[PDB]
Amino acid sequence: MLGFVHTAQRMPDKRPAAERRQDFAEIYARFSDERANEQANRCSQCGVPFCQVHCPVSNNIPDWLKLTSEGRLEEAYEVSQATNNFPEICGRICPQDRLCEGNCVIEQSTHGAVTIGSVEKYINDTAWDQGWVKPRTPSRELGLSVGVIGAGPAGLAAAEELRAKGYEVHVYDRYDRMGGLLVYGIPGFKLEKSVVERRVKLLADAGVIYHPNFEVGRDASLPELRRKHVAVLVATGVYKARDIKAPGSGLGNIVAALDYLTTSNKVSLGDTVEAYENGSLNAAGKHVVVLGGGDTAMDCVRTAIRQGATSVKCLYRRDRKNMPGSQREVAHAEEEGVEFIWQAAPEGFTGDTVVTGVRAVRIHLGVADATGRQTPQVIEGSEFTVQADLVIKALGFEPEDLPNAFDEPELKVTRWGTLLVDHRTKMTNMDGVFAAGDIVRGASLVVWAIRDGRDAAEGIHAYAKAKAEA
Amino acid sequence: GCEYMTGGTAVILGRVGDNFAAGMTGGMAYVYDLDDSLPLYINDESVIFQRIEVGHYESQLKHLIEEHVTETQSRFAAEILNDWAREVTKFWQVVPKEMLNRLEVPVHL
Ligand SMILES: Cc1cc2nc3c(=O)[nH]c(=O)nc-3n(C[C@H](O)[C@H](O)[C@H](O)COP(=O)(O)OP(=O)(O)OC[C@H]3O[C@@H](n4cnc5c(N)ncnc54)[C@H](O)[C@@H]3O)c2cc1C
């Protein structure tokens, strides 16, 4: 069942940029059945599977690969979901060209990578489409109160696992629509809002109680939370911003990326807010500039070209190769009709309380030293002005203030602002308080949150039983 | 340095000593100066120091430094090579006063 000698790799589908630039629908239609039999057969069932080592959740890929190559989709779906929760979204969001589909031995031999992500997506959609899906209710419910702060992917995964373990968990978050920033941060252009509501419905079906539209920083305090429950898991996530203080900043028509994204995509999907027409977050057909090079900037320029017609540019200080996002994303963006500027940084915001333009310079990167860093140096040779009326300050995130501000004068964090947890138990400095998600590691991916959530749930169960032993 | 040299090529990166190229007869040299302090050191009896203008000698020096950085894995030579367009103008070319008319390639425009 090796196959890859003769058959050639081919992605499922790709809608051209003619109709894609207008709608918010997906770009990838689902995968065909004969294509399923053909492309799943393409793998080599490589001994010592590198695809498993590099996968952050470490799920048994070649097993269901061979299965789908032979059929038998029931046990295939079973063995696929036995190890990784949230299979559809994790499969569709993973930057596979660098995590799992970037190390398949067939790809190192330049033959092409096995389309593992599409196989995961397809095997998890067909399985749901024919009712082979059920919640996980615990038999002989033990009965204990546990709380989770933050309904991100990590919190939801830990909640599902603990509900399967035999506990009673409560979900605290700040938004009305549960499901982490998946329903607010991630754009629908890359992840439609059906799978998330489906999975959160399945969660609620298992017997989990939600505490929607709360503010644990204001509505209550961590001592009260711990007194109400037996163990608490803080997964509040990161939501702060890093801005610049260039000459002429802080004036009108500048804004962060997260708010513009969430409102002008998700709340316009719901048709409720007025800032889409009241605020400047609209289709100003003149120009748009976006600072930063992370995936936030990529999704920002994507949704900017989607929402109305404009001419957009992007400014980034590093080079194309050190960009953290997926190179398929920048390829799609260039196909949509965006313009990129490499190795440049903004120095001034010229305007009259309204942004008229941006004054920027060009930098150069020397040769990397022993540690692997390439120091940047300004050139001064070409400092140019770029015309636009709105700039988007997408410069990443950083831990908010957690110890002092949120709840606890007794909470240990490092110089980064993030707190510390044990590599074995994932228990914080304070007893009964565990951590997981992106708070401990910083801005990371979804599957990392999933792995941390699973480990945190296991450690929570262990510690709870050990404490109840007395 | 290069005292009484007669033929070949000598590429030098960095500061030079005193009385450089004293009694030079034939050949050609290149020097990577950084502060225009070369005229206070070189001996101008029978040699002349100028700048590179012809693409042929530029390509020759480029290939020499490329092979050098390929050989010894030196990071400083790589830092020079990556900034070739900017750092090409700092190089001084030292040519004897005897090959002004005998060179196959015209050294002067
Ligand atoms: C392809 C791709 C694209 C990505 N795009 C983006 C992007 O555009 N933007 C981005 O930010 N990340 C992006 N990421 C990163 C990813 O979304 C996050 O790293 C990950 O979702 C972190 O989730 P989490 O479980 O740590 O919880 P988070 O998603 O970090 O959020 C934690 C939860 O706590 C809630 N919460 C926040 N404050 C409080 C509070 N005070 N009290 C109680 N609850 C609170 C939040 O509402 C949220 O539900 C992307 C990742 C990938 C792979």
Ligand code: SF4
């Ligand atoms: S990812 Fe590589 S090693 Fe794993 S099954 Fe596919 S071809 Fe074989």
Ligand code: SF4
């Ligand atoms: S999507 Fe995630 S779980 Fe699936 S193969 Fe890629 S890295 Fe592994």
